[PDB]
Amino acid sequence: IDLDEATRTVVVDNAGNTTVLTPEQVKRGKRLFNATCGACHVGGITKTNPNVGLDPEALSLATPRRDNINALVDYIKNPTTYDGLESIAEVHPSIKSADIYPRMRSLTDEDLYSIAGHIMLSPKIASEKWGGGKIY
Amino acid sequence: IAGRDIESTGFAWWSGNARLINVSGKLLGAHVAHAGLMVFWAGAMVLFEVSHFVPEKPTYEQGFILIQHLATLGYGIGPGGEITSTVPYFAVGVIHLISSAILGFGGIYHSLLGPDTLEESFPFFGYDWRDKNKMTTILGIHLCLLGLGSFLLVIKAMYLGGVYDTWAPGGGDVRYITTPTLNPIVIFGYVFRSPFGGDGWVVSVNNMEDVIGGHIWVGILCIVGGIWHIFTKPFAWARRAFVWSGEAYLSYSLAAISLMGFTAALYSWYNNTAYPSELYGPTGPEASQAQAFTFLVRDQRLGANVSSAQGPTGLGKYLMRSPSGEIIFGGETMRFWDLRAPWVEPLRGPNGLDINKIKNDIQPWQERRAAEYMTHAPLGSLNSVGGVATEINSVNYVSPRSWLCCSHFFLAFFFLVGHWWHAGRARAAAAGFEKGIDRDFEPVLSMTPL
Amino acid sequence: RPFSDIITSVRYWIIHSITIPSLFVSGWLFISTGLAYDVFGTPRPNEYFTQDRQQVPLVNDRFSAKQELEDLTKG
Amino acid sequence: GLFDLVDDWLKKDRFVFVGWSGLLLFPTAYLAAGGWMTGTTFVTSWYTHGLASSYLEGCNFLTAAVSTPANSVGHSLLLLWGPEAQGDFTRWCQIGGLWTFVALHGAFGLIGFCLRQFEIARLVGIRPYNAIAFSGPIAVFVSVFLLYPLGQASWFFAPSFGVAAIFRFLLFLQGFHNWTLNPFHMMGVAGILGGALLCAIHGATVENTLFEDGDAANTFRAFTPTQSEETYSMVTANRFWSQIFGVAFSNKRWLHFFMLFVPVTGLWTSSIGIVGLALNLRAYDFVSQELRAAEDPEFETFYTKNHLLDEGIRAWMAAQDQPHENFVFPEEVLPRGNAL
Amino acid sequence: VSLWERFCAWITSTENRLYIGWFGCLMFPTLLTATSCFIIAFIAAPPVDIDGIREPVSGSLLYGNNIISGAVVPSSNAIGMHFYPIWEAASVDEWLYNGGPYQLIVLHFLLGVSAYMGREWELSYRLGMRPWIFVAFSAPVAAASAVFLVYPIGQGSFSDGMPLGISGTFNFMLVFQAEHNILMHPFHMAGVAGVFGGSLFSAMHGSLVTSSLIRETTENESTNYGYKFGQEEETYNIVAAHGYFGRLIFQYASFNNSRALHFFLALWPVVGIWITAMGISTMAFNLNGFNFNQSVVDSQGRVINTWADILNRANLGIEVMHERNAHNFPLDL
Amino acid sequence: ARFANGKPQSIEAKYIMRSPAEWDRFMRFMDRYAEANGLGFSSXXXXXXX
Ligand code: CLA
Ligand code: CLA
Ligand code: CLA
Ligand SMILES: CC1=C(/C=C/C(C)=C/C=C/C(C)=C/C=C/C=C(C)/C=C/C=C(C)/C=C/C2=C(C)CCCC2(C)C)C(C)(C)CCC1
Ligand SMILES: CC1=C(/C=C/C(C)=C/C=C/C(C)=C/C=C/C=C(C)/C=C/C=C(C)/C=C/C2=C(C)CCCC2(C)C)C(C)(C)CCC1
Ligand SMILES: CC1=C(/C=C/C(C)=C/C=C/C(C)=C/C=C/C=C(C)/C=C/C=C(C)/C=C/C2=C(C)CCCC2(C)C)C(C)(C)CCC1
Ligand code: OEX
Ligand SMILES: [Cl-]
Ligand SMILES: [Fe+2]
């Protein structure tokens, strides 16, 4: 089995529209995610706050929905709590807190799009370990 | 070739450098060339790290080992441990490279074309391994040089731009140490205190004032000793307990340097003052304290009454009491209650961890620092997988503290072994039975039976 | 004849510069052409799973192992 | 006679001794080595263990192995012409016949090597102690690679010829049999460590009691093979060790016999223990302590902690170690301690 | 003739049944107190809390233990790396509750073995022999120091040291595997190679020497009786043994300078044990072995398990169970 | 315990009594070695002259 066209299609928006990630995008993401996100979100789990995981099920229950590329990209632009009552940009990496966190001082849009695509795509490949944890 | 063959010498090719014991000029050439090798490595590695530098990541995530030293000296570093520019590191690297070229040429010249023995032509640089006055003279000269170097560090920290101080008000930054501590009692309290937990023989220096004062004292002591050994001659009590030969001096130096290597290895693993966590990453205990702190904060946000929740064993899972009564973080990290970090001290009162400060006056930057330190603990693997041994390999990080400590501990023990070997051989050779027994004067046959 | 004498012989290297590289290149082409996958039955990186089965292809019987493997290794 | 000149040519003096034992030593040993070399390079373990064990699939030297055949096959010989494979080299490799090939050929090569030692001793006219010493490794191989899987369900539970596979075997036996608690293993480790001790101490003692037989610092060149007198002072070494330790050797023959004896008997005791494990007759529990802990939840020793570790390793390892059982353990079923 | 002189002389005498020497002045009292305390504690030491969670563990014979399960439990986790002599406790009972005897015994044992090395060298000097046996003995001393002192220093607590017992040793080894992956560390591999090679070379050297023994005895008398203490000629034939060894493997491959042979015998296990002690010391500061977890990936991206992943599975099984009540947070730092 | 401490003397009695042992040794050592100023052997670890 390959990383074919069927398995590279992910939700792009709330509606449900589904775009396709080019293989280059996949690579760049896996790189960017491992370089910046990996230290705390290795394996699709949140190391500091294990309750708020990164698996698609938890993203589906966040407020608002975080199970599509657009909402993940917006979350990077402007992060909120699990219920979305207030912003936690001062305690989470974000473009809004670019001054606080120097890592994002260079990230571009495509970079964010590729990172979100990787986050969306990895549970389609592994399908049980993205956010699973030790057990799996 | 007279001096370079197992016949003329009696030393095999593998132990070939021992042929230089009685050859003065060639030994000097070898020493100088080796020093040139050291300088070359320093310059080359600094240039390598500057080339592979990435401004996004902190230095302790890039696998760097030398930028941290020059940053601690106060070169191209801003408040909070941010790196501004990498030009001074490049300058240091190139200067070291050029000086290494000069030293290497000198070593080669003295090893190849230089006179084999310096005693005949230059009766000032010639020695005998057996007279004590010249040995003590050389020792005193180099001791004065070391004292001048310690002075130079003090001068750099006091009037040449200052040094980086983590405990500085408003965060870590470069400052001038205006008032170093000169009290002999406080300075030698480090030297004469216990090496066990809670004491930290010389590793437990806290502020920069103590560092500067200790260096002033070391420089003064080294200058005085260097002057004294130059003038005087070894006394009677030291004249009959020491073996006076080149290999014996080498063995003494080996023992001393093994002790120094052990000290530096354990010093890089525990110290936050001369090894700021913003450059070398958090220490062993620091990561554990950061984990306990960040989970305490997270559970406090939910509204749980911290310092009132009994742990699974009934001991208290957030706040405990130290065996001395101080209030500390609970869990397995109670073994690390001796920790003192710049981001946790604001919360400490005379009684320990103040509770009113924790409940009300918490800061977001402390949360970020604790999360970053917990996410970057001095854990890793030989292939630098990073994290716990059971973790999958996505991150790529091993803390420079681990590298420094492990490498220098290994080197220190093997130099202790070198001390054992060389001390034994030097004493046997001085006695005169390093080659065999005798077969006609076997001392066992002359001793009473038993 | 001792080893060193043979190793330093020129007539040895004139028969060890047309034999060794040829053998090395043949060993390279053994898997460059992909023959080794078929000879030993090891799966290629894209043959571990198929569209029909998404789990490990274990053998459960003994005297029908041939047919079972033939089926598993269908696609 | 035709037999006589053939025997003469077999015992011809050359670079390597062939002998009668060579006839089954060389082909069997060569085939075993070649089977291991091809196994860790091309053939896979996908269809027997659900693993990847080969350089072709991306494993390094530490992870490549020749894995045991599938558990569905029992203790079958997995002959290439057997009913399980019926020729067809590819399926023979896939179901795991290469493990049996390597094991059987290596065992016969091992027999050939012991026979070769006997024949060399007879030709040179010395006593055959070398074969008796080599009987130890033969016992270890027979007990671990042959008897243990034979006592178990199938060849699947024998150790696999690989670096990491042997580590898995170690951990598996510790978790399932409490092999460290077995007294025969304790005897084996005592024998092995004592052998290493004896080797190091004898080397140091001999090298540090050399006689003055030269004038150079290099003492290696003061020895000639055709020497009659002894090169080191037995008297001085004996006195030194009797003054330091309290007891010392005074008989070179007894010294070297002891050096022979220690590791061999260690290995033999370990082999007896492994043969015991093959039937699940393991020294697992201390009944008295197990009880007294069961009736009182305050009693604790390191022994009970080891038991907890064994239960954890067993429960967490069974699912992936034995894919043929189709073990499915939900998260709430797996034993786990606190937050960690 | 002064008194000091007379003493110094008796001390450095080589006619005493056991050599005292100046290093003996440190070795004897220290080892004697260590062994006295060990013998008493192995019989009648009360339970000790090792994890500092008020869950004492019994390790004494009089508390329902046997020889194998019994041990001298290391000091409490609450103490950590702090020095805990008798006089710092408020009562002897409390000192026993927090595992002070472990610290006492281990510190004295380390000083004693160091002084033992020194005494070996000193007697070598007195007897006029070449002084390198204590260099060989350094390897076990280094291993003991790494397992008893360096590892607690790196981990930050004396509770992490090896308990003085059998089952305690096994527990220490298993937890070390779980938390550090000792097996996949090249230094442990070097140590296993060194120990196996030491046993191999010991057995082979003994067999070769005993096989080629000059016939100087009957059949109804121990072969060992042919040799007489204080001989002047070799009781064994090097030529026959070397002929057998060369015919067994290869002609080139063989040692003749018996001195080189014995040096190699000394060199192999010693360097192996040194490298192993360095493995333990390096891993005390969390430089673990190779982690080849999920290294093999198919085209799609799914992970294909290797033999290393089953090792990780067993390590997880051990890890989630060790010190069940001690942990409160997800990471073991 | 963790109270730093010059050496580990906490009570003047402890220092004043760790004193006489070292001074006793100094005296017994001085008994042999006294009135020594010269006698330079000038050799490799000889110290032959008493
Ligand atoms: C830092 C390592 C070091 C140093 C400084 C030396 C130095 C020396 N060794 Mg030596 N040695 C070493 C490692 C070292 N060794 C090691 C590792 C071994 C074990 C293999 C030996 C084994 C050994 C033996 C057996 C002998 C020496 C001897 C000597 C001395 C004379 C060498 C000589 O005549 O060179 C002659 C060699 C050459 C002329 C060829 C080398 C050409 C140059 C020097 C190489 C470097 C060029 C450099 C890259 C160019 C830089 C130019 C600069 C302007 C930038 C000299 C003092 C001899 C001695 O005792 O002297 C009395 C001797 O007999 N050594
Ligand atoms: C400043 C430190 C220092 C100095 C000046 C010396 C000086 C000397 N030592 Mg020495 N030694 C030292 C430290 C030192 N030692 C230490 C720390 C040890 C403990 C291991 C020893 C152990 C030792 C022994 C056992 C012997 C000496 C001997 C000697 C003499 C001859 C050495 C020679 O020709 O080298 C020759 C150099 C070589 C052959 C190089 C060998 C390379 C080593 C084995 C591997 C290095 C690995 C390296 C870390 C990384 C490898 C990279 C690789 C993977 C590519 C000479 C006086 C000999 C003697 O007695 O002379 C009188 C002797 O027999 N030394
Ligand atoms: C002397 C060397 C030697 C030895 C001892 C063995 C031994 C073995 N090989 Mg083997 N092998 C060898 C050389 C050797 N091999 C060589 C050189 C090759 C390369 C061609 C192979 C290739 C090979 C393969 C490919 C396989 C083996 C296998 C085996 C094992 C089972 C063999 C079997 O059942 O047949 C036993 C055969 C005999 C006992 C025949 C002996 C000769 C008879 C007695 C002559 C008289 C018979 C007569 C004609 C019959 C009369 C009629 C009858 C009705 C009475 C066994 C351990 C198999 C294995 O291990 O699978 C797991 C397997 O598949 N071998
Ligand atoms: C005696 C002897 C020896 C030794 C020798 C020695 C040790 C030497 C050294 C040498 C050396 C130690 C050298 C060095 C050199 C250096 C150099 C030559 C440098 C150069 C530099 C440069 C060219 C630079 C450039 C640059 C710049 C300026 C900028 C940036 C870029 C770059 C970096 C490019 C041996 C062992 C061999 C053998 C025996 C004898
Ligand atoms: C810088 C600094 C510091 C320091 C300072 C100081 C001031 C130091 C010093 C140091 C010192 C001050 C040291 C000393 C040492 C000593 C020693 C180490 C000794 C040794 C000795 C010996 C080794 C001897 C031997 C012997 C004997 C015992 C017997 C007889 C013989 C003989 C003589 C051989 C501090 C930490 C504060 C802080 C930071 C900075
Ligand atoms: C099984 C089988 C068989 C057989 C086969 C063969 C016999 C093969 C062989 C093969 C071989 C016979 C192979 C080999 C290979 C080899 C190799 C692959 C090697 C490699 C090497 C290396 C890699 C090395 C390394 C090293 C070391 C070890 C040490 C030092 C360093 C170095 C790095 C050099 C037959 C046909 C009967 C058919 C049936 C099946
Ligand atoms: O104490 Mn003995 O084992 Ca070293 O990791 Mn943490 O702490 Mn406890 O857990 Mn895992
Ligand atoms: Cl914890
Ligand atoms: Fe021997």
Residue numbers in the entry:
A (entry chain V): 1 to 136
B (entry chain C): 23 to 472
C (entry chain E): 8 to 82
D (entry chain D): 13 to 352
E (entry chain A): 11 to 343
F (entry chain W): 92 to 141
Quote the original article.
Diatoms are dominant marine algae and contribute around a quarter of global primary productivity, the success of which is largely attributed to their photosynthetic capacity aided by specific fucoxanthin chlorophyll-binding proteins (FCPs) to enhance the blue-green light absorption under water. One of the important factors responsible for the powerful vitality of diatoms is their extraordinary light-harvesting capacity, which is achieved by their unique antenna system, fucoxanthin (Fx) chlorophyll (Chl) c binding proteins (FCPs). Here, we solved the structures of a PSII-FCPII supercomplex and a trimeric FCP from C. meneghiniana by single particle analysis using cryo-EM, which revealed detailed structures of monomeric, dimeric and trimeric FCPs, as well as their binding to the PSII core. In conclusion, the cryo-EM structures of PSII-FCPII and the trimeric FCP of C. meneghiniana provide detailed insights into the structures of various FCP antennae and the assembly of FCPs within the PSII supercomplex.
The Cm-PSII-FCPII exists as a dimer with two-fold rotational symmetry and its symmetrical structure resembles the configurations found in Cg-PSII-FCPII and PSII-LHCII from plants. Each PSII core contained 22 subunits (18 transmembrane subunits and 4 extrinsic lumenal subunits), which have high similarities with that of C. gracilis. A unique extrinsic subunit of diatom, Psb31, was missing in Cm-PSII-FCPII, which is probably released during detergent solubilization, resulting in the low oxygen-evolving activity of the sample. A major difference between Cm-PSII-FCPII and Cg-PSII-FCPII lies in the peripheral FCPs surrounding the PSII core. Cm-PSII-FCPII core contains 6 FCPs, among which three monomeric subunits named FCPII-I/J/K are attached to the CP43 side, whereas an FCP heterodimer (FCPII-H1/H2) and a monomeric FCPII-G were linked to the CP47 side. Among them, FCPII-I has almost a same position and orientation as that of Cg-FCPII-D. In contrast, the positions of other FCPII monomers and dimer only partially overlap with those of the moderately bound tetramer (MT) and strongly bound tetramer (ST) in Cg-PSII-FCPII. No FCP trimer is present in the PSII-FCPII supercomplex observed in the current structure. In the Cm-PSII-FCPII supercomplex structure, we assigned 206 Chls a, 24 Fxs, 2 Dtxs, 12 Ddxs, 20 β-carotenes (BCRs). Furthermore, two FCPII tetramers are found in Cg-PSII-FCPII, whereas no tetramer is found and only a dimer is present in Cm-PSII-FCPII.
